[PDB]
Amino acid sequence: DSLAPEDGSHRPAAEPTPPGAQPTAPGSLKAPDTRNEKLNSLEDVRKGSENYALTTNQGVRIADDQNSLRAGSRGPTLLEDFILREKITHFDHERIPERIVHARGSAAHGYFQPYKSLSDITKADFLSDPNKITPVFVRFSTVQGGAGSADTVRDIRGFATKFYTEEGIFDLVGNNTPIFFIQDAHKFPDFVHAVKPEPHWAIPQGQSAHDTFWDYVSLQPETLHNVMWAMSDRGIPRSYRTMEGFGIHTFRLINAEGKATFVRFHWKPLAGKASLVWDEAQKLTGRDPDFHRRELWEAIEAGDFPEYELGFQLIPEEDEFKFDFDLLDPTKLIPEELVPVQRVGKMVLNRNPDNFFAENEQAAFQPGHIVPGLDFTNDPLLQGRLFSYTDTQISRLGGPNFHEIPINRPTCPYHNFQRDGMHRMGIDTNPANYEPNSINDNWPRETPPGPKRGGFESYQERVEGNKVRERSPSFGEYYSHPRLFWLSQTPFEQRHIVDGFSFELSKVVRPYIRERVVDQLAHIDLTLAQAVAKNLGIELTDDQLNITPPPDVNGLKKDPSLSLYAIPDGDVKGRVVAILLNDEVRSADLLAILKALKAKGVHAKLLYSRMGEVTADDGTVLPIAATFAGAPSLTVDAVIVPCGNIADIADNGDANYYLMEAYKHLKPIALAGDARKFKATIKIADQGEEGIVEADSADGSFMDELLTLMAAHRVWSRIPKIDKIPA
Amino acid sequence: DSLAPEDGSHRPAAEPTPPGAQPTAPGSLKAPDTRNEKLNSLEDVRKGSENYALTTNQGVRIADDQNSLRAGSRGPTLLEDFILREKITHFDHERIPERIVHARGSAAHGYFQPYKSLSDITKADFLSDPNKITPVFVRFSTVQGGAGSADTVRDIRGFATKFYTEEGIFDLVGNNTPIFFIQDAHKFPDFVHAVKPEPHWAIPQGQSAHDTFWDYVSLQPETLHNVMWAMSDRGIPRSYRTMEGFGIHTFRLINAEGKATFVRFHWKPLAGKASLVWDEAQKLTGRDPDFHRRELWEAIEAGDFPEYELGFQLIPEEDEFKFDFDLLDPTKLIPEELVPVQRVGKMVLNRNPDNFFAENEQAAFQPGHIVPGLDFTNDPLLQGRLFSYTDTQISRLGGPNFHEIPINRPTCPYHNFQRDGMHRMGIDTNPANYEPNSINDNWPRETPPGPKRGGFESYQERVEGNKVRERSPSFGEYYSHPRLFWLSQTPFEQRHIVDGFSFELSKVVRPYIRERVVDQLAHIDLTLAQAVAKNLGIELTDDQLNITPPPDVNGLKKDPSLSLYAIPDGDVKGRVVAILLNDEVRSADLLAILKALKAKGVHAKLLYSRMGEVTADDGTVLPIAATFAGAPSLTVDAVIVPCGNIADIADNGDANYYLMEAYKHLKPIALAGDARKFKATIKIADQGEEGIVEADSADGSFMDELLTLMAAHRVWSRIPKIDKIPA
Amino acid sequence: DSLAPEDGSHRPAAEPTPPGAQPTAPGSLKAPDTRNEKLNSLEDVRKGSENYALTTNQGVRIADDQNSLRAGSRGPTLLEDFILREKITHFDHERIPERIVHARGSAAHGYFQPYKSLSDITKADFLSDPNKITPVFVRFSTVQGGAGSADTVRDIRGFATKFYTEEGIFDLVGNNTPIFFIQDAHKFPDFVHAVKPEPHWAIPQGQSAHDTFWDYVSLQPETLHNVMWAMSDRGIPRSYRTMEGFGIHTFRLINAEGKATFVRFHWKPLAGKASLVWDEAQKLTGRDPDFHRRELWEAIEAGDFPEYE
Amino acid sequence: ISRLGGPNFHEIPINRPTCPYHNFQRDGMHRMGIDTNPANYEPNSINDNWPRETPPGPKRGGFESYQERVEGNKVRERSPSFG
Numbered sequence A, B: 001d002s003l004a005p006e007d008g009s010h011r012p013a014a015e016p017t018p019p020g021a022q023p024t025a026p027g028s029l030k031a032p033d034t035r036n037e038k039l040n041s042l043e044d045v046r047k048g049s050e051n052y053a054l055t056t057n058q059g060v061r062i063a064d065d066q067n068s069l070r071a072g073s074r075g076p077t078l079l080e081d082f083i084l085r086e087k088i089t090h091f092d093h094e095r096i097p098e099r100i101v102h103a104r105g106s107a108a109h110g111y112f113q114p115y116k117s118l119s120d121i122t123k124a125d126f127l128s129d130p131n132k133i134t135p136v137f138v139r140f141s142t143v144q145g146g147a148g149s150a151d152t153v154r155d156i157r158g159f160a161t162k163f164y165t166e167e168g169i170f171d172l173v174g175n176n177t178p179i180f181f182i183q184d185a186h187k188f189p190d191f192v193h194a195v196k197p198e199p200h201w202a203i204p205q206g207q208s209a210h211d212t213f214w215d216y217v218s219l220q221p222e223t224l225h226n227v228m229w230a231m232s233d234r235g236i237p238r239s240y241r242t243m244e245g246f247g248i249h250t251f252r253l254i255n256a257e258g259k260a261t262f263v264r265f266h267w268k269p270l271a272g273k274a275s276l277v278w279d280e281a282q283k284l285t286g287r288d289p290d291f292h293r294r295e296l297w298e299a300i301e302a303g304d305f306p307e308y309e310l311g312f313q314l315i316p317e318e319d320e321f322k323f324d325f326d327l328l329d330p331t332k333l334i335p336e337e338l339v340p341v342q343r344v345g346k347m348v349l350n351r352n353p354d355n356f357f358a359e360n361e362q363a364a365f366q367p368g369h370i371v372p373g374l375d376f377t378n379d380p381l382l383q384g385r386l387f388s389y390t391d392t393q394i395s396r397l398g399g400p401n402f403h404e405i406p407i408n409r410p411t412c413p414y415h416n417f418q419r420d421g422m423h424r425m426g427i428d429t430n431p432a433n434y435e436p437n438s439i440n441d442n443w444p445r446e447t448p449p450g451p452k453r454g455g456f457e458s459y460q461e462r463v464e465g466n467k468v469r470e471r472s473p474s475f476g477e478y479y480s481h482p483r484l485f486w487l488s489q490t491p492f493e494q495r496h497i498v499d500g501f502s503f504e505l506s507k508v509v510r511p512y513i514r515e516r517v518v519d520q521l522a523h524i525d526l527t528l529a530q531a532v533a534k535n536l537g538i539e540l541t542d543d544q545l546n547i548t549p550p551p552d553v554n555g556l557k558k559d560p561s562l563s564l565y566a567i568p569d570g571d572v573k574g575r576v577v578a579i580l581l582n583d584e585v586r587s588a589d590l591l592a593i594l595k596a597l598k599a600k601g602v603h604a605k606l607l608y609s610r611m612g613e614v615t616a617d618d619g620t621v622l623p624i625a626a627t628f629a630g631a632p633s634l635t636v637d638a639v640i641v642p643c644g645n646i647a648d649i650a651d652n653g654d655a656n657y658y659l660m661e662a663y664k665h666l667k668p669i670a671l672a673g674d675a676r677k678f679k680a681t682i683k684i685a686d687q688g689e690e691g692i693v694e695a696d697s698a699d700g701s702f703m704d705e706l707l708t709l710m711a712a713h714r715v716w717s718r719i720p721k722i723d724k725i726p727a
Numbered sequence C: 001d002s003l004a005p006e007d008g009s010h011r012p013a014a015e016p017t018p019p020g021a022q023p024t025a026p027g028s029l030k031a032p033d034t035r036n037e038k039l040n041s042l043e044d045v046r047k048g049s050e051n052y053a054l055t056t057n058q059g060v061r062i063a064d065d066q067n068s069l070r071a072g073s074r075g076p077t078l079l080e081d082f083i084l085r086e087k088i089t090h091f092d093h094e095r096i097p098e099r100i101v102h103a104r105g106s107a108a109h110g111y112f113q114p115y116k117s118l119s120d121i122t123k124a125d126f127l128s129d130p131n132k133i134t135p136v137f138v139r140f141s142t143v144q145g146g147a148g149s150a151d152t153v154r155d156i157r158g159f160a161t162k163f164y165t166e167e168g169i170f171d172l173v174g175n176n177t178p179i180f181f182i183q184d185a186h187k188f189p190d191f192v193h194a195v196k197p198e199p200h201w202a203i204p205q206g207q208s209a210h211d212t213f214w215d216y217v218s219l220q221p222e223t224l225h226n227v228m229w230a231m232s233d234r235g236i237p238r239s240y241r242t243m244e245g246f247g248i249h250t251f252r253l254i255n256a257e258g259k260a261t262f263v264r265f266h267w268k269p270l271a272g273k274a275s276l277v278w279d280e281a282q283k284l285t286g287r288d289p290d291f292h293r294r295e296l297w298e299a300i301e302a303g304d305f306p307e308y309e
Numbered sequence D: 001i002s003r004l005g006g007p008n009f010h011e012i013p014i015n016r017p018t019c020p021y022h023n024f025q026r027d028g029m030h031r032m033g034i035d036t037n038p039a040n041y042e043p044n045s046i047n048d049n050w051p052r053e054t055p056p057g058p059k060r061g062g063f064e065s066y067q068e069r070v071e072g073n074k075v076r077e078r079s080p081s082f083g
């Protein structure tokens, strides 16, 4: 060997580069100077490779790693080949059970800092000073599919954050919608079995579009609120960077005085909210099933660090019963019009892992991992989650020492009398393994609860009632939140919701199930019920037309913070544009394009009908990132076609389809000079249309107009015209 | 609170102290300055305790570790109690499967050094320089019993040594007898199932005295040689310090020129060879089932470091076929009169572990863990062993990363393309996980074999023959090695062997099995078979009386290295003497006794009818180690009774029995002044008797005579007189 | 070949015999006519052996079970020997973790029957009718020692009964003294760590006679009551047949009208109460460490069925 | 052994032979079969050596490997014929 090319092009540069410019790499090679306390303490288990000899695991150097030991060179393999056996054995035991739910996910390292001290409301140490930085490890995920399933499915997304604080690990384990599907953890296996692949044949993967899900939903109207979010474009985010996160349950903040405040946790995406459209999402599960995982990783390698603002909705203990819903009911959201989100800090994700399995796959988060200054509530869904994550981690990660797996280790001290268990790493020197003891002078010792650095003491909440298996009558209301959700959506968001339900219910084979779901929609909103019914060829009865809509939520008839798009929050930095090249590109158009993209932090992908390079009109050699078919429009946010020799691609089927697909999917399109010939493939008026940028050259205002469209994400006014396009 | 006594007597002194003087403790607290390269590298996972707060595994401080969280102080325990749940969950999962064989064992840290370079015969780096120190971890064990079974059972002993070399771990996994019971690995489960507790009722523990063992033995005469070692006093060693160790198999040494030399490995105990007698051993399993584990640990805390000399039996490739037996047959020993053991180096065990479970229980040794400079042979029992150990470790230690458990880790570099698996600690940064690769320039890389630091390449032995399941005809001889062993024993050794078989066969319920074993003994030696038959009320037939004895082994009719005692090798340092106190001890006797014992490194334990203290004749306050019943004569090597007020213990039942038990078990006894009144208890002549030290006071020659008896270990001439003794 | 002696003296007679008269044997060979519903349902998974060929686990008959496959009779073992590999692999994976506590234990099958209907105080179906028999499986044990430790140590004894009822399994998991050492489950690991072998050297086995235990007891006076039982001759029973058993906790009986009655469960030994003396017990741990296991099995083989009220 | 939790994966219903299987292997995680054989080893006299070995033969015989001739040195080497 000397396999590497002599020019060094096998190794990516250790500096921020745009998506697709270099091969991606382990975080610690790609960005060796990005550090935080967690990332520095993982340094003891990191292994290098360059300049080392290949060995067995026992440190024996290997001479020939190409062959098994045999009796004669065409003979039988011998049992004494301990090198083969160790290598095959390790390979044979590589896999561990995937997570029962949220098996599919993507993770990154980062840090958090508060905006100011929150000691008036919580004694939680990570929130006590704006200069105190807490390292974090975040894992984003889907819910239903296996570890090998696709990213852009329609589903809820998980959003889990491990805070490595100085007084313990705090895991904030949330999703991307503000409520869950069910109220009591006793029904979690029933709900999850219903949405997962059906048990006789294990179909379908990553989809709720099947009979058992809609059967369960039709029989359990508590589910309807999260089902509404899942059927909206919230179920198909553009990126884990452009979705919100929520803890869902009401928890408690506890201050040094012992006062409890009810809280609901929020993550606000600083890149803004943005989702795909169903056809694009579903096709993308086939063109690039790793699309979210890839775009997260590459955004970090490019310096487009995912940033989220931590927000709290705070409710005084005395206001527990002032809403028309139960605050402990996880199928109910707290409208931001009633209880605003107070901004409290920012988290930045600025480094990828080194080994996906070691750090992402083995990561273990628990909602029960809280610290002094925080506490639980009686939310019956949250209460059952406190049992389940520790239990599931004993078999997923092989034993009770999963806190010793490097990614999961606290960065603060931990000492106790727990001993042994499978794969015990820590070697205890304590003469005692029990307390109280005199032989080690009772160390390690308990610590009284206090303002800081004190022991954990539960908030002394009053408990009164009988031992009962019973749902609180306050939780038996199921249509007002789904209604408030529906009425807060724009007209196109409502349409997407109708089309989500219609598509999904079309795949339910038993027709009575679709009719039972349509009946439930009629108790939410009649316009929604009717439009779904019409796509299913179902007719509402007399009685269904007279169902009285549920009441407003505390007087609210809408809450624009529930919409993805009603209030503009577009950010173009980190988005990507496809540029369709020709064999003689007008280089003046390219410079103007590339310069304007660069100024907003927008990336470009130069596409052509083959790989290699093409030469512009001034001799600039342009390297091609991908072909038209290899990097479809689904993977980009907008498409620009510069002038040059358009005859080269004017009859290219793939080139024409690229624009028809982008057009169908409502993406901004910009055509310079003779690129305007492509207006006939997308049947666009001679005079132009909103959403289509066109001019003689890709000049001054042409780029500003494209970038304005991109900031608004998609061209929703084109919806009525895409119906006709065969694409 | 306040638990430690204010005088600090809860903590043992950090310096060498005699057995029983202080509470024993973790190695790193007891002897913090004893270091070696492996002990230093374990420092990264060692945990402290003093001055730390008590936490959960996630680093959250605990305020109340005495109570569960409940609804009211007499209410039901709440599911939200995460502190209770982690603590009980870790406890609930403490246990891991015990080793299938050798589950019971005791271990210690130490170091090895060769006497001179062995470069001429092996390129093994640990043996290339007398100044090169190799850290070791050694585990001694029994074979049959579980991890909770007793130490002083009659069984074979394991003696496994892990060498942390600069070119890889080398495990030398041997036993305390030079042969094994069976020839081919395929019968290992059969042999082990036969010796282990019987399957219907799981009895008996720690014993071969039962029908299935002797049934297998009587049908598989290959077992007879190791059975003779086990029935001898070799099966009941006095200590892991006073037994020999052997690799058993013939292995190969490979030098830099590629020459192979056959080698059999040996460990010589520098404390000498010494065993118990059956009655003592059996009773000791009940009075102190942890006797060997305790004795080892305390010898190391006292500075009596177990020391062993590594020795090689070397045989040139050309002499492979020159013996009467096959060198690859593991039921055959290589007589030291034909092939002397050449001294190679010294191993010293000088520090105990910190945590038995983490370092002892999880330690994993494999005979397949060899390094360049060593190689295997076709011994068919060893060949099968190469498969078994890695296999068993995937379940016992939970996955294929058992090399990352701290005690098992190489101290030299290890790098390769193995990834994942349960409990993966190492975080790999190599962009490649395969070779050949270009993206990491093919690192880590293969290394050609060579004189030092080269890759492992198997010795190119010629193989020729058909694929067969067939025992070599050269292995078909079963009685000459058993006969050589027998004839090399002293007369009292022979009697102990007769009694071992007689005792064991008396526990076999089916009489025909005892008859068939007796018939096999008659093919070894008629004197042995007749004496066993007579103890079993069996009469040999006329053809059994005419079976021709097997031939001598290469002309030898005996080899004194096979006896424990024929060639004196006694060493008193680290032995212990019981001193039976009275309530007015003559202090002049005690000073003479204790100073003489101290000069030879012999320990003492001051015994009485109660605990606390007694006052000598001159006011000296004497602290009592144990009562007569609490520390029986079984635990000591000799007994001394000083003068004083003998009428205080003259009629104590326990005091008298102490002497009868030590007298029956052939230990030296010394009686000073009026203590000679006890001569009537042990019916000893007025004139005295060899083995009994007696005088007017414990003064000049008294102690030298007692120490001479101790140097010879036991008073074998007393055997004919102990048969009368009711004790 | 091989055989069994021609006189058939290798096989125990299938009828009640006294301790030591014959080799002991699996129950369904020793007492083929003893049945109950549980014992009969286990017949689907019972395996015989006589008259069957030796095979791999995949049903392939084995021709030579004495040798590995090698290249020449003195050659190296070949990787293709799948018979050897399955055989050693099964053997290598025999062991499972022992119980964290109560690892040392001896068990037997049997049956339970109430004297009269308890329908006035409980709706439990196994106690509703004096002619309704409930199969049981009982496991008796020590607490501290491993599964290979000794039987006649000084310790508490566990007495666990599995009732196979018509409305579900009821497990009555008790001990041989009416109280436990500690009050709250949160201290269990603390107490058990203190009585168990000390963590630096893993000594001593099957004994509370050591510093950590007595340190814990001296700092936690709530332990004293069970300590008193443990130090009496209740800590060294003569047999599992001659000790009491107790559920320890207060549980509840619920009748068909919904009334709750507090209840504490007891087992009375119909063989009477009897214990060893310390010296005898401690010596017996060395002369016969399987004494309670052996004497229970042999009592059942002899027709001296352990009976408890 | 790790995918299916132990050495008794032949007892999982789908994997079970439909023909007889008897041998001296015992124990292992999740052991379903309850063995009544007084012996768990061979050779044994206590169960008259059952279950027993069967010689190879034309039908219903024990497995015996074909006696191919092996000749060469112990090498880690690719056959030149494969290149």
Ligand code: HEM
Residues within 6 Å of the ligand: A098, A099, A100, A101, A102, A105, A139, A140, A141, A157, A158, A159, A160, A173, A174, A175, A179, A180, A185, A188, A247, A248, A249, A330, A363, A364, A365, A381, A382, A384, A385, A388, A389, A392, A393, A396
């Ligand atoms: C508000 C409702 C819930 C939310 C927001 C939620 C969120 C999550 C997230 C984000 C993950 C993946 C964490 C990771 O990335 O590793 C997860 C995993 C999991 N969840 Fe929850 N969950 C909810 C309800 C429940 C309930 C009610 C249960 C059972 C009672 C449950 C059991 C589990 C389990 C067993 C896992 C796998 C954990 C592992 O293997 O480490 N979840 N959940």
Ligand code: HEM
Residues within 6 Å of the ligand: B098, B099, B100, B101, B102, B105, B139, B140, B141, B157, B158, B159, B160, B173, B174, B175, B179, B180, B184, B185, B188, B247, B248, B249, B330, B363, B364, B365, B381, B382, B384, B385, B388, B389, B392, B393, B396, C088, C092
């Ligand atoms: C000369 C013959 C043998 C010797 C000297 C020997 C020695 C030993 C020793 C000393 C140990 C315990 C290591 C420790 O303290 O952890 C051990 C364990 C073991 N032996 Fe061997 N043994 C022999 C034959 C065999 C054979 C033929 C097999 C199976 C083919 C076998 C399978 C095992 C297994 C499975 C373990 C447990 C290992 C673990 O769990 O790490 N042994 N043996």
Ligand code: HEM
Residues within 6 Å of the ligand: B088, B092, C098, C099, C100, C101, C102, C105, C139, C140, C141, C157, C158, C159, C160, C173, C174, C175, C179, C180, C184, C185, C188, C247, C248, C249
């Ligand atoms: C009155 C108090 C208790 C009694 C009478 C009792 C009794 C027993 C008995 C008889 C067994 C062995 C069952 C068998 O033969 O398989 C056992 C096992 C066990 N006990 Fe308890 N115990 C008590 C308290 C506790 C507590 C407080 C805990 C933990 C909170 C606990 C945890 C365990 C565990 C983990 C096992 C092993 C079970 C298994 O592996 O199947 N015990 N106990």
